[PDB]
Write an enzyme that holds these catalytic residues in place. Sequence first.
Site, short mmCIF file in Angstrom:
data_model
loop_
_atom_site.label_atom_id
_atom_site.label_comp_id
_atom_site.label_asym_id
_atom_site.label_seq_id
_atom_site.Cartn_x
_atom_site.Cartn_y
_atom_site.Cartn_z
N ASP A 42 58.96 52.96 98.22
CA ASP A 42 58.88 52.60 96.81
C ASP A 42 59.60 53.63 95.93
OD1 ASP A 42 58.16 51.94 94.22
OD2 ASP A 42 56.04 51.72 94.61
N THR A 43 60.86 53.37 95.58
CA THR A 43 61.62 54.29 94.72
C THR A 43 61.04 54.44 93.31
OG1 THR A 43 63.20 52.55 94.06
CG2 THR A 43 63.76 53.94 95.97
N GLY A 44 60.18 53.51 92.91
CA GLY A 44 59.58 53.55 91.59
C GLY A 44 58.29 54.36 91.53
#
Length: 198
Positions: free
Chosen positions: A124-126
């Site tokens: 999850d890059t967020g």
Amino acid sequence: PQVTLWQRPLVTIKIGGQLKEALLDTGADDTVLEEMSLPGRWKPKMIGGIGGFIKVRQYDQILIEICGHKAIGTVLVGPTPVNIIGRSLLTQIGATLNFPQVTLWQRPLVTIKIGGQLKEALLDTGADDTVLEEMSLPGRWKPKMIGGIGGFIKVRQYDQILIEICGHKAIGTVLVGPTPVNIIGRSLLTQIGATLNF
């Protein structure tokens, strides 16, 4: 460009004639923007995240220019704390996650081993940090509140926790609490050499 994950992966976008900044978010199925003026019809929608759910307006066939790339698709508008570009637009700009290479037509799941247990988690890059659903972990921890698309949750902060992510080892902070999905955040993504490419 290629982007490492030592900082939030932010991009400049143009939508509805307006300029905004948004987070490239591999953990988000769809694009969700803070309240703004968009042209045309929209349908009422509920979406979930860490913290619970929020009510959004769903616009389809919305043109977005994300960096120098144009895309058309669904844009949700509502009470999100940060503008996020989700997988349904990421795929349109040819974005991939590398660490294996992975396209984003499906949720980027990986198998991890932590505390002697096997689990599946979303790259999850967020997410700043790693957050796992309730599980048994050895040792001491600190109370902590973290925020997300539907509000805040209370988590336990465990430090210097060993995780083997897709067979790569890394040691870092792991939050445990009522997240709907296990997520691997940037603080561990950097440790396995993960990059976003588009």
